[PDB]
Design a protein around this ligand. Structure first.
Ligand SMILES: *[C@@H]1O[C@H](CO)[C@@H](O[C@@H]2O[C@H](CO)[C@@H](O)[C@H](O)[C@H]2NC(C)=O)[C@H](O)[C@H]1NC(C)=O
Ligand SMILES: *[C@@H]1O[C@H](CO)[C@@H](O[C@@H]2O[C@H](CO)[C@@H](O)[C@H](O)[C@H]2NC(C)=O)[C@H](O)[C@H]1NC(C)=O
Ligand SMILES: *[C@@H]1O[C@H](CO)[C@@H](O[C@@H]2O[C@H](CO)[C@@H](O)[C@H](O)[C@H]2NC(C)=O)[C@H](O)[C@H]1NC(C)=O
Ligand SMILES: *[C@@H]1O[C@H](CO)[C@@H](O[C@@H]2O[C@H](CO)[C@@H](O)[C@H](O)[C@H]2NC(C)=O)[C@H](O)[C@H]1NC(C)=O
Ligand code: CLR
Ligand code: CLR
Ligand code: CLR
Ligand code: CLR
Ligand code: CLR
Ligand code: CLR
Ligand code: CLR
Ligand code: CLR
Ligand code: TCR
Ligand code: TCR
Ligand code: NAG
Ligand code: NAG
Ligand code: CA
Ligand code: CA
Ligand code: CA
Ligand code: CA
Ligand code: CA
Ligand code: CA
Ligand code: CA
Ligand code: CA
Lengths: 781, 781
């Protein structure tokens, strides 16, 4: 394998894969000459701390007599540089003894790798030989496939819960308009696809989806940046590692794009490549996920005990020293430098999260080996309950014991893998703040995600600790469209997602009292829409009311007419013996005055709220009363020109025959017209039989015409103080009144028609009463 | 490597990876004993034909002295069983000489593999050693990444064009409501993601997205089947291979789900696992993609020459013979069996598509080796133009020459790889029909996809050759909602994609003349929507027209009044010497008759379409004329009770002053009311100054009342044939006819108000003319 390595000799050997470098020298191999090994460039102190965690765990296990007594653990650890090719060279180094036996110490298990693509490439080769591989950082769901990867286990949780938690965080702050950026690898794509599913189930619309890489060209990065600029969405879900996101962040910083809310996956939410003060105007206020911190007592002292000369087994200490103090062993360095003097991620960490995963992977392998070592002969997991010989143990036996592993931590937590080889765990939710004292980016814990909880209760966030964009205390707005107010409704914008809608006000008569209403609700039959359609109010009912001032005036005039009729009748009764009262027919005068009273009472019927019987008794009453009065006048004229009572009764009987017939066949009824005006319901009467009203008015007018003619023939005659002329005047007044109001008798419905009717009745009755009796009263004085 | 193999010795050795079996035995070991090599189970005749294509191409290259003279090509071909593990054992066999030199013949290049995941796993290891690998079937876009895969090339096109073509096919048949099923591997997921991007670009909504595998459990297959059943989408885009889709198709056949329109990716559009007659009630009428067929002359004879004993280099011939004739060497078989007698995919093919790809991969390697062999010393591709020694050639040199390869086919087509190592090519579009003679599934070509064309013109389909669901000539319906007709618009269904909309009819006064109208267009100011709301028509304009029968009657009465006035005037003029004409003032009689003519002419003004000047000259004309006539009557009464002309001129001067004043300050103007009724515009007049009309009517009525009183004081006087009584009658007629029509003078606008106005004017004028002149005419007779 590669010359630079960390090796210790032992009975049982653990392989190790760590990213001591962030990547390799990015250059296209010309193939002009023999291609030499690609060089790793940028030093990764956090990865070196992870390697030190593996070495520390192995040394701790060796020193403890409790775990694996009389057996020494060795390691062979190589640098992957986050690259598949280096990892595969190291893995070929791991499987040499198996390759010899398929077509150098034996490797019983491997710790690593970090990246999911690297782990997948390694796991193909390792599961070929059934060598167990416990990864500390690779969290792709693709590695949960136990058909493809027979010997892969994880001390890190799967990525599915992280994508679901990202969706839950988006839902918590009431966002539905977000963007997605993913690394174009086995980490980014599966996570972003799970997020897309969990967002579409939550009615969250994703504006854009882009893929990036550390090897993305200038044109591709420009395209992604310009896609971000053209978007209105300010919440961008980025599911990537640090190296894969660094070119995009650098370009966005160079363009000074601000105001975006970055939701970070665990792989970069704590990355020193991205969390730099000079990027804070772009990436400040990032909300991201972190793993559960763990404690390794004595680990920091072990880290501080590093030295090029003293660490002979660890061959990566030389470059660590050279890159720490910027020395060579560029000024020469003695080796007396102090680790505590330099600001690097090596010692200057707050929580051990992936380091604890490395520690747990080593201890899981150690506990599987201990379970092999302490196997009682008849209680084994193998054929017939047999147990493996720890002196001649094979990798598949360790894998079998790992699939059944269940051991207690140093922290008192049960570590066990499921069928998919996954270790479930909580998430912490962190926010990127700026340190006032130091100016560096500080990761403040603002919440957690409890994967052990039932759906809907897993997410907890304390928003008072969140500073949006690094400085703001107001939750930002990340919806495509503003909500549609009450009084409006949503309308579709063609070619755009459901989240993007236009606001269209409700039509007349339809109310929408809910903000963001899909459609405008219609109002019931008797209601009409509010002014702004934010509610609707009952329709106003319209008729001729008693309390109304106009109705009051009409009722006042009706009662005045009744008073005048009663006054005339009383004058006639008290002074009937006078020759003037004797000259005219006293009985017929009484009957005429009673008829006038009935006519005024019938005029009172039209006023008021219509009812079925009221509409039944308005026209018949007036018709009968007026025919009665006209008949009394007619018989008085016939006297002027016993039997008189016969004629008046005949005419009134005819009229009541019409009235009874058309009340029996088709009675008038009150109906509430809603077609005249939308806002107002006009409560009016329905005739039932129009030809019946025709017969009513025709008979009344025919008797009127007969009396008119008979009085006209003898108008000059001076009998009863020329009563014939006054009778003609009264009849002609009746005709004037009922001719005058012809246009208003129909069409103009509502209170106007009833008002015109009662006014016509009052005018006709007053004219008749005056022309008949005012001259006689004047004579009496 | 594996014992079962195809090896031939030679100077330059080609590796080979083929799926001689469809998969591996379902032996999931509990790891109780040492795990033995997993065995492959279902024989794959098409894969054996592909292997034979490789061997045949090598044999022609060896036999032909034109290509690679004096150099013999050897092969080492292993079976992958579509499995990463077997392919990696074979690839470790390929890289043994490099592994010895990194920590058995040398392999200069490898042909394979079929699956994209298998090819990816192989390519990691091969590009580690810079060994070129030319795949014949793996089409994942992930393999185009030349950072991850340094030595991978393809004789098969990429999958991006096929996903775009799937989207174009969906667009062509006007579908927006489709489902997606993908294999959960490096083939299915990238293809389905590209399809999702191209579909969302085209506003196609995807109802469901499911992932399947040959190892999918019963519960997962049940979930996918029930998701398909709950969906209304009938077009399902499936981007998978045969083995990965077989369990789902079997389950769907068991439930007998029909009516689905399967869009097939190339990997299964020609698969014998899926294209089975017993599945045709489910998968009949499938529309899928095929590669471009190629011709290999003499290949079929070579296939027919297969024999267990004769084919000593090909070790897969034994199992091919045993599976073909169901014998062993289960009855014993001599070996005299005839290949042509058995119906297998081996000989019974129609087109060579992947076989031609295998042939082209072998010839691409051969032409790269020829370019190395014929390199002129100063024109090489290596350092300083140097050339590689073909006797001591290395794999990286062959890879370098492959990246620059450009050679002519046996069919006269240029084969060259781009920077990504891709070989672009056309697609054919095929439909799954049932054979009437045989009952097997027949792949009929129904179109093509020309990737060399510009976007929008790549797809060609002849729908006449397509039988939907295998038997139907009608394009099926795959939209979420029916289109919204003209007179309707679209409305949002909450929680659902844009493709799923409700149809809501347009509001009153709004029209949508387009199907699938997003919103209802409002109509212009003078238009209103029809009952269907499919368009809107001009509003009816309403006034009192001359042509109208009622207007005709009014004009007839006006002209009759003018005729009567002219008749009276002529009688007076011709017979002025008679004592009755001399008794009344002849000059004042002429002036009064002229005033009556002016009044009738003013009554003519109200009739007709209103205009600014017409509304200016309706009321003033009547007012002035009526003041003329009233003043003439008044001075004639004053005679009854020079200066007469002075008094009439004074009154008419007051009238003309008021008219001039209110015409100068605020003239009446024609206005088009739209607030009375939505459907109808009412063209009427606007007074301008209401108090001006009040003063006008007040002055007219005041002069009228003065004349009334003066005539009442001398009503009994017998002068001029009791003319004072008739003057009182005329003035009373004026008052009553103007009182009678009071309610109609306002509110009831439109033609009704003008009609009532002209009727009032005619009634007043007729009454005045009659009461003045009819007595004198009767005396004259
Ligand atoms: C952004 O859009 C979302 C989804 O439409 C809004 O969330 C809904 O808001 C309404 C009214 O506040 C609630 O009745 C719903 O229950 C919410 N749905 C959820 C939370 O899933 C959110 O209010 C919008 N934010 C804005 C407009 O600032
Ligand atoms: C995951 O997080 C939850 C919530 O923080 C943890 O549940 C808490 O457990 C402590 C005891 O250690 C209780 O005092 C709290 O009341 C619990 N909070 C809840 C239930 O909301 C849970 O223990 C965590 N799991 C792991 C493995 O760390
Ligand atoms: C299914 O829905 C699609 C939506 O695109 C319809 O296609 C549109 O149809 C309208 C008809 O007025 C055309 O104007 C558009 O140009 C079409 N667009 C596309 C992209 O094709 C399609 O007609 C619908 N099919 C039905 C209802 O059977
Ligand atoms: C891809 O398909 C197109 C269309 O079928 C091919 O273009 C045709 O080329 C032939 C000549 O070989 C012409 O006769 C046709 O008229 C062309 N059809 C067109 C332009 O629509 C094209 O040659 C094919 N390319 C390959 C590499 O097969
Ligand atoms: C209701 C109106 C519109 C239509 C019916 C009008 C009829 C009934 C009225 C209106 C005018 C009335 C006429 C007025 C004048 C006279 C002349 C007199 O010597 C006999 C009666 C007679 C002939 C009246 C008969 C009835 C009459 C014709
Ligand atoms: C329009 C309706 C409601 C009211 C009409 C009022 C009518 C009916 C009343 C009011 C004034 C009355 C007139 C007063 C004076 C006279 C003069 C006399 O020699 C004949 C009767 C006559 C002509 C009366 C006829 C009827 C009359 C015109
Ligand atoms: C009864 C006698 C003494 C007088 C008759 C006067 C008559 C002819 C006139 C004078 C005032 C007029 C009213 C004035 C106001 C209105 C309100 C309108 O929306 C309906 C018509 C109505 C109700 C009119 C009816 C007819 C009316 C009452
Ligand atoms: C229609 C409504 C307004 C009622 C109108 C009442 C009018 C028309 C009636 C009631 C009293 C009547 C008057 C009663 C007394 C006389 C005196 C007589 O020598 C001439 C007729 C004359 C002057 C009558 C004219 C008409 C008259 C005024
Ligand atoms: C403007 C609208 C409301 C019409 C107004 C009607 C007025 C102006 C009319 C109608 C009835 C008329 C009155 C009828 C009766 C008489 C009594 C007589 O001895 C003098 C004239 C006099 C007093 C008239 C004056 C004018 C008069 C009051
Ligand atoms: C409502 C309008 C349009 C028409 C009204 C009809 C008027 C104008 C006409 C028609 C019949 C006429 C009446 C006919 C008979 C008489 C009796 C006489 O001794 C006094 C005049 C008097 C009372 C007339 C008054 C005016 C009169 C009522
Ligand atoms: C002068 C002569 C004609 C007598 C006058 C008769 C008057 C009082 C009556 C008889 C018939 C009536 C008309 C009948 C029809 C209508 C149509 C209606 O939508 C408006 C009112 C209107 C236009 C009426 C106006 C008044 C009217 C003309
Ligand atoms: C305005 C519409 C209704 C026309 C009204 C015409 C009426 C009111 C006028 C026109 C002609 C007039 C008649 C002309 C002649 C005479 C004869 C005289 O000895 C008595 C009056 C009497 C009978 C008049 C009564 C009223 C009268 C009928
Ligand atoms: O699976 C993967 O690729 C990522 C790699 C990764 C995770 N967390 C990290 C922290 C630092 C560096 C790398 C990582 C989570 N899993
Ligand atoms: O990349 C892949 O996985 C698929 C495999 C494949 C294709 N076409 C085929 C025909 C038969 C068998 C397998 C295949 C296209 N590429
Ligand atoms: C692991 O052991 C603990 C007790 O030591 C037990 O509670 C737990 O159920 C065990 N886990 C499994 C998966 O059996
Ligand atoms: C390949 O060679 C042919 C000559 O047969 C030439 O026409 C063609 O342009 C060449 N292709 C490239 C990409 O140079
Ligand atoms: Ca120990
Ligand atoms: Ca790594
Ligand atoms: Ca990082
Ligand atoms: Ca769009
Ligand atoms: Ca040759
Ligand atoms: Ca294969
Ligand atoms: Ca197949
Ligand atoms: Ca939904």
């Amino acid at each position: 394998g590669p010359d630079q390595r960390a090796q210790k000799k032992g009975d049982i050997i653990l392989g190790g894969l760590f990213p001591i470098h962030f990547g390799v020298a990015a250059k296209d191999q010309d193939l002009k000459s023999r291609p030499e090994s690609v060089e790793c460039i940028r030093y990764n102190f956090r990865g070196f701390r992870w390697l030190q965690a593996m070495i520390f765990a192995i040394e701790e296990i060796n020193s403890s007599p409790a775990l694996l007594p009389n057996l020494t653990l060795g390691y062979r650890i190589f640098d992957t540089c986050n690259t598949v090719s280096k990892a595969l060279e190291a893995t070929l180094s791991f499987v040499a003894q198996n390759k010899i036996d398929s077509l150098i110490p034996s490797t019983i298990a491997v710790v690593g790798a970090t990246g999911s693509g690297v782990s997948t490439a390694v796991a193909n080769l390792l599961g070929l030989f059934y060598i167990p591989q416990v990864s500390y950082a690779s969290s792709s769901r693709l590695l949960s496939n136990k058909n493809q990867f027979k010997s892969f286990l994880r001390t890190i949780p799967n990525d599915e819960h992280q994508a679901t938690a990202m969706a839950d965080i988006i839902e918590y702050f009431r966002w539905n308009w977000v963007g997605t950026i993913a690394a174009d690898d086995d980490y980014g794509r599966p996570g972003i696809e799970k997020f897309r599913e969990e967002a579409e189930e939550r009615d969250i619309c994703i504006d854009f989806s882009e893929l990036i890489s550390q090897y993305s060209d200038e044109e591709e990065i420009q395209h992604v940046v310009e896609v971000i600029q053209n978007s209105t969405a300010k919440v961008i879900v980025v599911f990537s590692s640090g190296p894969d996101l660094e070119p995009l962040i650098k370009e966005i910083v160079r363009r000074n794009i601000t105001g975006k809310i970055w939701l970070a996956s665990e792989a970069w939410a704590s990355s020193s490549l991205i969390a730099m003060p000079q990027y804070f105007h772009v990436v400040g206020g990032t909300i991201g996920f972190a793993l559960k911190a763990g404690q390794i007592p004595g680990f920091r002292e072990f880290l501080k005990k590093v030295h090029p000369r003293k660490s002979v087994h660890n061959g990566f200490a030389k470059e660590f020293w050279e890159e720490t103090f910027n020395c060579h062993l560029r000024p020469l360095c003695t080796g007396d430098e102090n680790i505590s003097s330099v600001e690097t991620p090596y010692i200057d960490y707050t929580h051990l999260r992936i380091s604890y995963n490395v520690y747990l992977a080593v201890y899981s392998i150690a506990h599987a080996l201990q379970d092999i070592y302490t196997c009682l002969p008849g209680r084994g997991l193998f054929t017939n309950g047999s147990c493996a010989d720890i002196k001649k143990v094979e990798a598949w036996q360790v894998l079998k014991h790992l699939r059944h592993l269940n051991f207690t931590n140093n922290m008192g937590e049960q570590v066990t893998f499921d069928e998919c080889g996954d270790l479930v765990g909580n998430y912490s939710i962190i926010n990127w703040h700026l340190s006032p004292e130091d100016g560096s980016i500080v990761f403040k814990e603002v919440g957690y995600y409890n994967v052990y909880a039932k759906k809907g209760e897993r997410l907890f966030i304390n928003e008072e600790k969140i500073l949006w964009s690094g400085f703001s205390r107001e939750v930002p707005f990340s919806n495509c469209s503003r909500d549609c107010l009450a009084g409006t409704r949503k309308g579709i914008i063609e070619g755009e997602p459901t989240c993007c809608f236009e606001c269209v006000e409700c039509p007349d008569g339809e109310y929408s009292d809910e903000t963001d209403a899909s459609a405008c609700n219609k109002c019931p039959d008797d209601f009409w829409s509010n002014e702004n359609h934010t509610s609707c109010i009952a329709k106003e009912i319209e008729f001729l009311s008693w309390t109304e001032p106009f109705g009051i005036a009409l009722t006042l005039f009706a009662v005045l007419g009744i008073f005048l009729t009663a006054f005339v009748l009383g004058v006639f009764i008290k002074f009937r013996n006078t020759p003037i009262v004797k000259a005219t027919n006293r009985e017929l005068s009484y009957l005429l005055l009673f008829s006038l009273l009935c006519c005024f009472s019938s005029s009172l019927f039209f006023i008021g709220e219509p009812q079925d019987w009221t509409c039944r008794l308005r026209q018949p009453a007036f018709g009968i009363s007026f025919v009665l009065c006209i008949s009394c006048i007619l018989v008085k004229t016939n006297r002027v020109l016993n039997l008189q009572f016969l004629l008046v009764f005949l005419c009134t009987f005819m009229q009541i025959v019409i009235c009874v017939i058309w009340l029996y066949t088709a009675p008038p009824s009150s109906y509430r017209n809603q077609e005249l005006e939308d806002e107002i319901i006009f409560i009016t009467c329905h005739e039932g039989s129009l030809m019946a009203l025709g017969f009513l008015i025709g008979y009344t007018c025919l008797l009127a015409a007969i009396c008119f003619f008979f009085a006209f023939k003898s108008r000059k005659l001076p009998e009863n103080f020329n009563e014939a002329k006054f009778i003609t005047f009264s009849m002609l007044i009746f005709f004037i009144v009922w001719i005058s109001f012809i246009p208003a008798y129909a069409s103009t419905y509502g209170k106007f028609v009833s008002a015109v009717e009662v006014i016509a009745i009052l005018a006709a009755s007053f004219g008749l009463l005056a022309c008949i009796f005012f001259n006689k009263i004047y004579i009496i004085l």
